[PDB]
Amino acid sequence: HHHMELTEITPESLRLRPSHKERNVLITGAARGIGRAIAQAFVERSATVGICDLNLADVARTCEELNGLGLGRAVPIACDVSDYDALVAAIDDTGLVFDTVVNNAGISPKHNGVAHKVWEMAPDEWRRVVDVNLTGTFNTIRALTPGMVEARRGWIVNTSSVAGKTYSPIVACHYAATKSAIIGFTKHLAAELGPYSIRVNAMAPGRIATPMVAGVAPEVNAEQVKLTPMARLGQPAEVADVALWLTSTESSFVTGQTVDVAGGLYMA
């Protein structure tokens, strides 16, 4: 079960450059996994990060972990992102004005390790995935855009998936539909918000070595890796680098784009 070593190593002096100093960045799904990696990256770049996720103890643990790096600061934002009023209250309690949001929160429910097919799918499961993956992303944007418009300043990064652009047999139809939604939502938002100098982009991860992914049967990852031209799983930090770039001054004329982070897997 081999896979390619990482080949492109960012020197520490560049990895820790203060590119995002004096930025307040809200990250959803940030306690664990890709969201946690995104948060780590923003702290590394001297941003203040709002760690938004469901459980306060889990969120506070990740905040402690990030604040131990001695660079940017992490603050807890415990809420269900699908509950607009709860989200606003949790944001308000930080006292921070967030100029940036990275919408990473998403779920991909399974049953005995496999996606339900559409003809098997419980309407309640569909609705929950829509609520989190799609409406949760709307909610942060609705919460923060009044301020961004007033400031004529802001950055948004949403999370799609290669599965939103073409079929992955790993996921169920709700995941595909919600992640597909993000692509045209992102273009629309880019057009509405662009007059105010706000940029809106999205990332479409492929198969990333988070604990949930890496823990599947070797056969399933092996198949996915075989389908990946670059011959390995992506690392969470590689997704994070794209979120950094899309919110940085070095993507200053890039808006409305969905950039896959997938090593060639499921190109569409």
Residue 97 DSSP class? P
Q: Element (H or E) spanning 259, and its range?
A: strand 258-261
Distance (Å, whole) CA 224 – CA 241: 22
At residue 147, φ and ψ (nearest 5 deg) are: -65, -45
CB atoms within 10 A of CB 107: 16
Contact yes or no for 77/89 (Cβ under 8 A): no
Two structure tokens written together for 53: 């996720």
Check: CB of residue 169 under 8 Å from CB of residue 259. no
Resolution stated for this PDB structure, in Å: 1.4
Nearest to 258 by CA among 194, 208, 189, 193: 189
DSSP code of residue 112: T
Let me know if 175 is a catalytic residue. Answer: yes
Rounded Cα distance, 42 and 15, in Å = 10
Catalytic residue chosen out of the listed positions 84, 167, 175, 266: 175
Buried b / exposed e along 199-235 (16+ C-beta atoms within 10 A): bbbbbbbbbbbbeebeebeeeebeebbeebeeebbbb
Distance CA 111, CA 88 (A): 33
Sequence-ordered list of residues with C-beta below 8 angstroms from that of 167, at least 6 positions apart, any chain: 176, 266
Neighbours of 40 (CB within 10 A): 23
Identify whether the C-beta of residue 45 lies closer than 8 Å to the C-beta of residue 66.
no
CA distances from 237 to 6, 42, 94, 267 (A): 12, 11, 26, 21
Identity at 70, one-letter amino acid code = G
Chain centroid to CA 207: how far? Answer: 13
Domains and CATH numbers, the chain: 1-268 (3.40.50.720)
Sheet of 155-159, strand order: 74-78, 48-53, 24-28, 100-102, 155-159, 199-205, 258-261
**Coil vs helix vs strand at 84:** helix
Whether the CB-CB separation of 114 and 170 falls below 8 Å is answered with no
Query: In whole angstroms, what is the distance from residue 35 CA to residue 170 CA?
Result: 20
Q: What is the 3-state secondary structure (H, E, C) of 207-250?
A: CECCHHHHCCCHHHHHHHHHCCCCCCCECHHHHHHHHHHHCCHH
